[PDB]
Amino acid sequence: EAWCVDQRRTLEVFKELSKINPSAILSAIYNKPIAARFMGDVLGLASCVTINQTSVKVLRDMNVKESPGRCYSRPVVIFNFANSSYVQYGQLGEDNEILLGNHRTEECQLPSLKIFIAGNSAYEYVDYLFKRMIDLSSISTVDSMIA
Amino acid sequence: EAWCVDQRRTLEVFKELSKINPSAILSAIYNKPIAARFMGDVLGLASCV
């Protein structure tokens, strides 16, 4: 009895964060990885295309030209579909999604320090400029399981 | 069985609100009061005075 109540209200947290990042909450429910886009009261589905993999390249400046103070919230990227060789400009979404035209930018606050994981390497950006590769295994990971 | 599933998806709500106010979600998990700052995909720790 008490169970379906944890269940019933924690539905309403799902509906809530769906309004923010529907990809995540939907995937969490149905377990599939599933991309999804927010639209109003009604959240549509959207399907993916896997690109060249190698190569994808991470550009070292996260400032936009022009101008300051307009800065990308995520590192910008150049990738290829394949078979093909048209060089495109995505923007490193999380969990290896490359972002078409919705460029998360986000206006220049100093001083920053964010680090972004793409594939299996972490890229530390100190002041919207790149600084160093970061050891992905150095970063301890929150285990949370109430067992 | 059904338990670890409330557990598994409500991990993904934690990861989500960590992106907003990591201090809170982290403290909620580990029970300590713990300050923390958002940085990218990777959320650093920070200590108080």
């Binding site: 150095s138 990971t141 929150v142 | 934690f14 960590s18 990777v42 108080c48």
Partner: peptide, 24 residues
């Protein structure tokens, strides 16, 4: 308890990340 604090990141380390680490 919850004193009047000011919190910052001292050294470079240390950082925690999330990942999908529980599997049913």
């Amino acid at each position: 308890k919850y004193p009047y604090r000011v919190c910052s990141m001292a050294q470079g380390t240390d950082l925690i990340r999330f990942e999908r680490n529980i599997v049913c």
